[PDB]
Amino acid sequence: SLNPKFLNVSSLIQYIQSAYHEPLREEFKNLTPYVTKLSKVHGPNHPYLVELKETYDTFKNGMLEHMQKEDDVDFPKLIKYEQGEVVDDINTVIDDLVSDHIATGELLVKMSELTSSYEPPIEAAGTWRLVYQRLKALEVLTHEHVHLENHVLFKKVS
Amino acid sequence: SLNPKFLNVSSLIQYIQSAYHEPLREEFKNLTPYVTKLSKVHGPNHPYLVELKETYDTFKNGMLEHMQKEDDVDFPKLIKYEQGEVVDDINTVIDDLVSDHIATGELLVKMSELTSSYEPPIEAAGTWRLVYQRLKALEVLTHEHVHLENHVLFKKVS
Ligand SMILES: [Fe+3]
Ligand SMILES: [Fe+3]
Ligand SMILES: [Fe+3]
Ligand SMILES: [Fe+3]
Ligand SMILES: [O]
Ligand SMILES: [O]
């Protein structure tokens, strides 16, 4: 099995973008209608599901803006720094990306708290259980993703 | 641990170069003196150690020339073929690389036969036991190396 420590900065970035950023965008497109439906249908009975929709939307919009910043501005800066060019704001860039990750992590903590980890009541059927499983999988994937960035990619440039 | 289907050709090549090629060159530099000393001290009364020295040398020079060919000429062609440019000898390239790996593999089975699968005789000590340990691990390392190229890297482009 392949050890990410041997990748250099630009391969680690290509890997992140293929394994994490693009599947994340696609899962967001696919999953948001279901979160919205769950809120619309059972939110009146259960107000924590409306809070879940809004926390999920905030989580999603933050992640999309964060991945666009990484793809368009900041990952290219890490690559330039690895090649020997002068990059000021390199620790500014790293610190803002770490701040973004910490915020995303606390939103995941909140979503999981809202759903009692991701345990659906016996009242739940179909769309409800789908949303819970997908949100749990999105949390696992996001944890792996930001751990790769924080403890491998950023350590190679700091 | 990485999933190779998200590494493109360029990144997987960089991976192989950091994880196998450069460590293998370092290990050849460090291990050769010990092989030469084992054959010089114990070779006279144990001629299979002299045969082992000559087989190891052949295996090692073939590996070094083969990795040079991949790094300087053939891996860049795999990357160009991934990137759409015309590389009308790609299959020739892959066939010669596969044939090289076969030849190396057979040199390894020979080295293993000479050493009874790298288990030292009782009367061996020190340098003799060191050489068998290091050769055993270098065979393990080389099989992984060759399997990654043959069955992951070369299948991305053929
Ligand atoms: Fe990211
Ligand atoms: Fe990130
Ligand atoms: Fe190789
Ligand atoms: Fe090779
Ligand atoms: O991220
Ligand atoms: O190789």
Numbering used by the authors:
A (entry chain A), B (entry chain B): 67 to 224
Can I see the authors' text?
When first described, ScdA was placed in the so-called “repair of iron centres” (RIC) family and proposed to protect iron–sulfur enzymes that are damaged by ROS or RNS. We now show that the previously enigmatic di-iron enzyme ScdA functions as a nitrite reductase, converting nitrite to nitric oxide (NO), and we elucidate the structural elements that support this activity. Using an integrative toolkitX-ray crystallography, solution NMR, AlphaFold modeling, and pulsed EPR/DEERwe solved the full-length homodimeric structure of ScdA and identified a robust di-iron center that forms stable iron-nitrosyl intermediates. Our findings demonstrate that ScdA harbors a di-iron catalytic center, consistent with its placement in the RIC family.
We also analyzed a cysteine-free variant (C30A/C31A/C191A) by SEC. This CF variant produced a single peak at 10.9 mL, confirming that ScdA is a homodimer in the absence of intermolecular disulfide bonds. However, the N-terminal domain (NTD) could not be resolved, presumably due to low electron density in that region, suggesting that the NTD may be relatively flexible or disordered. The crystal structure demonstrated that the CTD forms a homodimer, with each monomer encompassing a hemerythrin-like domain that binds nonheme iron. The dimer interface is located between two intermolecular α-helices (helix 5). We conclude that an intermolecular hydrogen-bonding network formed by S77 and Q80 residues on each monomer underpins ScdA dimer assembly. Based on the crystal structure, residues H87, H132, E136, H167, H211, and E215 were identified to coordinate the di-iron center. Notably, the catalytic efficiency (k cat/K m) for CF ScdA is ∼2.4-fold higher than that of WT, indicating that the three native cysteines (C30, C31, C191) are not strictly required for nitrite reduction.
